[PDB]
């Protein structure tokens, strides 16, 4: 739904506005889980190739973990940009059409009469 927005560069992974966003912390649970998935992928690959599960293919396991963390970091930055621009468009549209989003006045619990349903 956000592909037709104004200023949308076509097939652009990380546009320059994403540079305004704070980057992922590089030690955060999403990237740590991505590295864990890469290590699990290496272990499962060893077990399916009938190698020793952990002490075989250390370079392969390192490459799996590194590639998973790298791809996860850049994809996470892209998704952070997408959610940020979604909230930016939502807030801008709300500010542009305030008559369709009126500030409703919530009364206190002294003028409203909630019906009482006795449990007995």
């Amino acid at each position: 739904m956000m592909n037709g927005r104004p200023g949308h560069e076509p097939l652009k992974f990380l546009p320059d506005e994403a540079r305004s966003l704070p980057p992922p912390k590089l030690n955060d649970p999403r990237l740590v889980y991505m590295g864990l998935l890469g290590y699990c992928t290496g272990l499962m690959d060893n077990m399916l190739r009938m190698r020793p599960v952990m002490r075989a293919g250390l370079h392969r396991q390192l490459l799996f973990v590194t590639s998973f963390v790298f791809a996860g970091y850049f994809y996470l930055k892209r998704q952070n940009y997408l959610y940020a621009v979604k909230d930016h468009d939502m807030f801008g549209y709300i500010k542009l059409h305030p008559e369709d989003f009126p500030e409703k006045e919530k009364k206190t619990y002294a003028e409203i009469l909630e019906p009482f349903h006795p449990v007995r």
């Binding site: 206190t108 619990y109 002294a110 009469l113 909630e114 349903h117 006795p118 449990v119």
Partner: protein
């Protein structure tokens, strides 16, 4: 005694003086004297030792008091912050009322056991206090359900006041 007679009232004991008509010795008096000399003296000695050890290592603790947060009646609906504060205050007052009912019931039981054969006459004020606090408790807390809350208590009070006002019309 950590308790006080203002909240646990007790009439003063009226024991009669012994008037032994018989010349036989009283085995109860003999056994109470022997029991004192054998049991009560070492027990009070070790208790005095424990009390002086506590006096050597004396510490204090306090009773926590909560300020009155604004009631749920001035809390706007959908404002979960003040609603949470009022709900926690209401649960606190609910627990205090439970213990108040426990105090009143314990007082009534003490009256009944003290009077014995005269409980139908001499526990009139205790039974009246129990009845009044039971009626107030039923007016504020009864039939709320398992998910009792300040909102449900307020709705019940509003319904009861509406019924009373409609009855007061005629």
């Amino acid at each position: 005694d950590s308790w006080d007679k203002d909240v646990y009232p007790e009439p003063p004991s009226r024991t009669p003086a012994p008037s032994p008509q018989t010349s036989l010795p009283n085995p109860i008096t003999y056994l109470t004297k022997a029991y004192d000399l054998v049991v009560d003296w070492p027990v009070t000695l070790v208790r005095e030792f424990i009390e002086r050890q506590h006096a050597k290592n004396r510490t204090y603790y306090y009773h926590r008091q909560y300020r009155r947060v604004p009631d749920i009646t001035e809390c706007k609906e959908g404002d979960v912050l003040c609603i949470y504060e009022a709900e926690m205050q209401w649960r606190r007052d609910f627990k205090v009322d439970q213990e108040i009912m426990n105090i009143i019931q314990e007082r009534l039981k003490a009256c009944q056991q003290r009077e014995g054969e005269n409980y139908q006459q001499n526990c009139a004020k205790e039974l009246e206090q129990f009845t009044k606090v039971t009626k107030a408790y039923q007016d504020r807390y009864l039939d709320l359900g398992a998910y009792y809350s300040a909102r449900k208590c307020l709705a019940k009070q509003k319904q009861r006041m509406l019924e009373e006002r409609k009855a007061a019309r005629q």
